[PDB]
Design a protein around this ligand. Structure first.
Ligand SMILES: Nc1nc2c(ncn2[C@H]2C[C@H](O)[C@@H](COP(=O)(O)NP(=O)(O)OP(=O)(O)O)O2)c(=O)[nH]1
Ligand SMILES: Nc1nc2c(ncn2[C@H]2C[C@H](O)[C@@H](COP(=O)(O)NP(=O)(O)OP(=O)(O)O)O2)c(=O)[nH]1
Ligand SMILES: [Ca+2]
Ligand code: NA
Length: 846
DNA sequence: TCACGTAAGCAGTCCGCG
DNA sequence: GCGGACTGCTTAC
């Protein structure tokens, strides 16, 4: 069988690698890797190594990775380029596995674990590990078993063994209702004391060493707590056993808010699922706790319980253990749907990197490009330092705030990667420059043609047409791979066999990699950073969008015989929005039998008339810029309008990036019932309260489908009833940054943000109460305004999102929450923006 | 929120300033 | 009042 690596590390002059051999067995080996770097040489010095610019290079074989690292220093001292992959472990992977890696995931030990710690005096800080670990559930992907470690005796009480029979009982039987598909997969291990529990866990850890270590908040809590707790009791020599190479290190994470403290376990790849979720899910959630996410993803959260979790083990040890098992399983269910782990394994093995590097698109792309270049015996350039500088981005047209009855939309296919491929943009394909005219001249095709020999961008860059660049070459491959999976996602959407969400992630998360490459060219840490290339992409995007805007207006003017009219109402980056009122009027709205009739008509007109006109409109631009390959593909997206015969307005814009459409068709998907397409509005902002999002969305639905009278009817009913709503559902949400920065003596300091003020108000209310939930820096909070004269002392209070507010102050908050201010700022004010733009009244006049 | 990007809207604070 | 400069936060693409 083909060999593939599991983990790889660099410790001194040795490479530590865990891998699967040809027999399918997991092996470990330490290799004295002798790396090689490159330096430019005279042409007379024959070689097979050249850089990306065709300049000859000499291969320097070093006795060890130390000599190679020191050589880079000397070359820097001299001031000459030191070419080659300076990340020696990546080069080792490239040499060891010089072929496309086809891995077997069943041989990869993926570990999903979570722990429980009873703490009567606040959150148990992993740096201290003051309190005993009384529960550990450890799922092993190879064994397909849930190994449960249960502490029976601790200074916080002695308990009886957990019952698997009771845990299997339904909730209405007093049981825990632990899923039947995992109850037979539970391995229960009771322990008389903590030392025995931890000792056995390490023996368990060494026998089944995790390759992929995951869970929820395992990196910031579970891993450092276990490491420190074992350290305090047995010493670091025993805590080092958590690594298969017996080597760890305390890693400090830097950001714009302070430093962090995690533990690096060499030989292990940690993929904390909360980090995998935040990056790959394409959602911004009010709360990122496991219970909130499980509710969103699975319509079911963690196991519910009574009283604080600090007293759960003593009061209901049965539930306490079952709660712990379910926590681990919830992550396995979320992953079975999201497939973020399998995505990471795909990306990591495709790029030939450490699996945990999938968090970094830069490192990922650097190794893809390196391996690609090495294949042709080409040598990558040395990374350089650059000052952070801004550069132009996409174009956004200022829409006229108004209702728009009939709307048809068109969008380009993966614009930026396509631009890269079409123009042939790459660090080595640069050919020169041309004198630039104002951009509006290229849009109107009145400026002189840039070149008859090179592929050009309206930013002034010229690229070779007859040679390949590594960047267009490698981005094409990943683009094509997504296209193959996208051919499966649209199926399930139209058929809705199944496949969708996973087939969605398969395609949508692949695009995150290909979209990040264009951005990478504008990041100073990318090896192939170049603002000329990065601007060439975005400027081309600006041109193409407004070029096709002009072309669509021209085509629709001559076809409708109207002259000079504006059909394109709005555009953003890769899309355009066309008013279809005039098209409908040509046939006559009375000549349509029903809603589907005019939808079928606009669909036929878009495909047979507009689309071929659009493609012709792009082929000439391709000729104008003398591009290498025509790839500006813009096809029909949405078809929107009110129901036939109704009083709905179909859609509306309030401004840039803010609009609502009543869509009947999306590409190949024809909706049985009209779907709302709402972008940018408060219904989409996670900072808007849950019950307000729903109410606003219903206000919008009535505007687009039913009209003014229905909207006013619903508004009047919502204002009369909204006080009944649960306080959490009407609470605002916001991320909490730099709390201490605006903290002066527990009271709001200068320029204190409104939500931060709510946090300080909360901190005073719970001050002295060591068991009360603490607002964490960098996390999110629920926010409620407070009526004047409230006992809390300020205009608002804020508490951790995704949770009920503590029973200490809950009754007071309910009594003093300002329903009026809440209604005006979150509901009425945005609704005023929607209706005034749509020329509608949410309240009666005369 | 730990070396993909820019564009751009709304909430709120504090400032000249008339 | 009231408008702009600014921070903070959010989304679209
Ligand atoms: N092409 C390339 N090689 C690199 C780079 N960085 C380090 N190397 C190193 C990796 C390799 O150590 C060396 C050249 O590897 P090969 O010519 O592809 N195969 P050969 O039969 O010559 O192998 P050996 O040298 O063991 O005889 O340059 C890089 O960026 N590019
Ligand atoms: N750097 C960067 N640019 C982006 C990102 N998202 C969008 N852009 C810019 C670059 C993109 O070229 C452009 C549009 O990106 P899509 O909305 O994803 N449209 P596509 O046709 O690719 O996906 P589908 O086939 O599913 O419709 O916006 C991003 O996360 N990063
Ligand atoms: Ca698209
Ligand atoms: Na696109």
């Amino acid at each position: 069988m083909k060999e593939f690596y599991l983990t790889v590390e660099q410790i001194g002059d040795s490479i530590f690698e865990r891998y699967i051999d040809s027999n399918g067995r997991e092996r470990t080996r330490e290799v004295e890797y002798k790396p090689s770097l490159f330096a430019h040489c005279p042409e007379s010095q024959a070689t097979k190594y050249f850089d990306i610019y065709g300049k000859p290079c000499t291969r320097k074989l070093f006795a060890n990775m130390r000599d190679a690292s020191q050589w880079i220093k000397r070359m820097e001292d001299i001031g000459l380029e030191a070419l080659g992959m300076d990340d020696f472990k990546l080069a080792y992977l490239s040499d060891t596995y010089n072929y496309e890696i086809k891995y077997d995931h069943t041989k990869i030990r993926v570990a999903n674990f979570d722990i429980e710690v009873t703490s009567p005096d606040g959150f148990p800080e992993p740096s201290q590990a003051k309190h005993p670990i009384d529960a550990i559930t450890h799922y092993d992907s190879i064994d397909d078993r849930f190994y449960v470690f249960d502490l029976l005796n601790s200074p916080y009480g002695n308990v009886e063994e957990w019952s698997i029979e009771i845990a299997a009982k339904l909730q209405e039987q007093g049981g825990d209702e632990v899923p039947s598909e995992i109850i037979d997969k539970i391995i229960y291990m009771p322990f008389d004391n903590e030392k025995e529990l931890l000792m056995e866990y390490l023996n368990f850890w060494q026998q089944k060493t995790p390759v992929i270590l995951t869970g929820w908040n395992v990196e910031s809590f579970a891993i450092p707590y276990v490491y420190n707790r074992i350290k305090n009791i047995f010493g670091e020599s025993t805590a080092k056993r958590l690594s298969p190479h017996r080597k760890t290190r305390v890693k400090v994470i830097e950001n714009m808010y302070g430093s962090r403290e995690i533990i690096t376990l060499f030989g292990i790849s940690v993929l904390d699922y909360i980090d995998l979720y935040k990056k790959f899910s394409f959602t911004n959630q009010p709360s990122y706790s496991l219970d909130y996410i499980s509710e969103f993803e699975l319509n079911v959260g963690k196991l519910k319980y009574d009283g604080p979790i600090s007293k759960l083990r003593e009061s209901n040890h049965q539930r306490y253990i079952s709660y712990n098992i379910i926590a681990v399983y919830r992550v396995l269910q979320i992953d079975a749907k999201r497939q973020f782990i399998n995505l990471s394994l795909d990306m990591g093995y495709y790029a030939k990197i450490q699996i945990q590097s999938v968090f970094s698109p830069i490192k990922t792309w650097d190794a893809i490009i390196f391996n690609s270049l090495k294949e042709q015996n080409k040598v990558i350039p040395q990374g350089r330092s650059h000052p952070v500088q801004p550069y132009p981005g996409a174009f956004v047209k200022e829409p006229i705030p108004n209702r728009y009855k009939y709307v048809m939309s068109f969008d380009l296919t993966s614009l930026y990667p396509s631009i890269i491929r079409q123009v042939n943009i790459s660090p080595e394909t640069i050919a020169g420059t041309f004198k630039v005219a104002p951009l509006h001249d290229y849009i109107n095709a009145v400026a002189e043609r840039p070149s008859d020999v090179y592929s050009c961008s309206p930013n002034g860059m010229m690229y070779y047409k007859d040679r390949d660049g590594v960047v267009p070459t490698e981005i094409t491959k990943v683009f094509n791979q997504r296209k193959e999976h996208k051919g499966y996602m649209l199926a399930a959407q139209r058929n809705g066999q199944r496949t969708e969400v996973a087939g969605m992630t398969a395609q949508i998360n692949r695009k995150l990699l290909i979209n990040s490459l264009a951005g990478a060219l504008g990041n100073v840490w990318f090896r192939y950073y170049d603002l000329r290339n990065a601007t060439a992409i975005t400027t081309f995007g600006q041109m193409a969008l407004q070029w096709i805007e002009r072309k669509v207006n021209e085509y629709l003017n001559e076809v409708c015989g109207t002259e000079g009219e504006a059909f394109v109402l709005y555009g953003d980056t890769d899309s355009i929005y066309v008013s279809a009122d005039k098209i409908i009027d040509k046939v006559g709205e009375s000549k349509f039998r029903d809603t589907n009739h005019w939808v079928d008509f606009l669909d036929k007109f878009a495909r047979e008339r507009m689309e071929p006109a659009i493609d012709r409109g792009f082929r000439e631009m391709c000729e104008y810029m003398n591009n290498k390959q025509h790839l500006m593909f813009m096809d029909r997206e949405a078809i929107a309008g009110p129901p036939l015969g109704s009083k709905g307005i179909g859609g509306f814009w309030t401004g840039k990036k803010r609009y609502a459409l009543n869509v009947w068709a999306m590409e190949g998907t024809r909706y049985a019932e009209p779907k709302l397409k709402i972008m940018g509005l408060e219904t989409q902002k996670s900072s808007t309260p849950k019950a307000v999002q729903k109410a606003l969305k219903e206000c919008i639905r009535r505007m687009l489908q039913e009209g003014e009278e229905s909207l006013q009817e619903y508004f009047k009913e919502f204002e009369k009833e909204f006080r009944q709503l649960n306080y959490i559902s009407i609470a605002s949400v916001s991320s909490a940054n730099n709390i201490a920065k605006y903290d002066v003596g527990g009271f709001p300091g200068p320029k204190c943000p409104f939500h931060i003020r709510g946090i300080l108000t909360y901190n005073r209310a719970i001050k002295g109460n060591i068991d009360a939930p603490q607002v964490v820096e960098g996390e999110k909070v629920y926010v409620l305004p407070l009526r004047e004269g409230n006992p809390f002392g300020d205009k608002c209070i804020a508490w951790p999102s995704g949770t009920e507010i503590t029973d200490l102050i809950k009754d007071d908050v309910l009594h003093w929450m300002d329903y009026t201010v809440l209604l005006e700022k979150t509901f009425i004010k945005p609704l005023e923006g929607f209706t005034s733009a749509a020329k509608l009244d949410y309240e009666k006049k005369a």
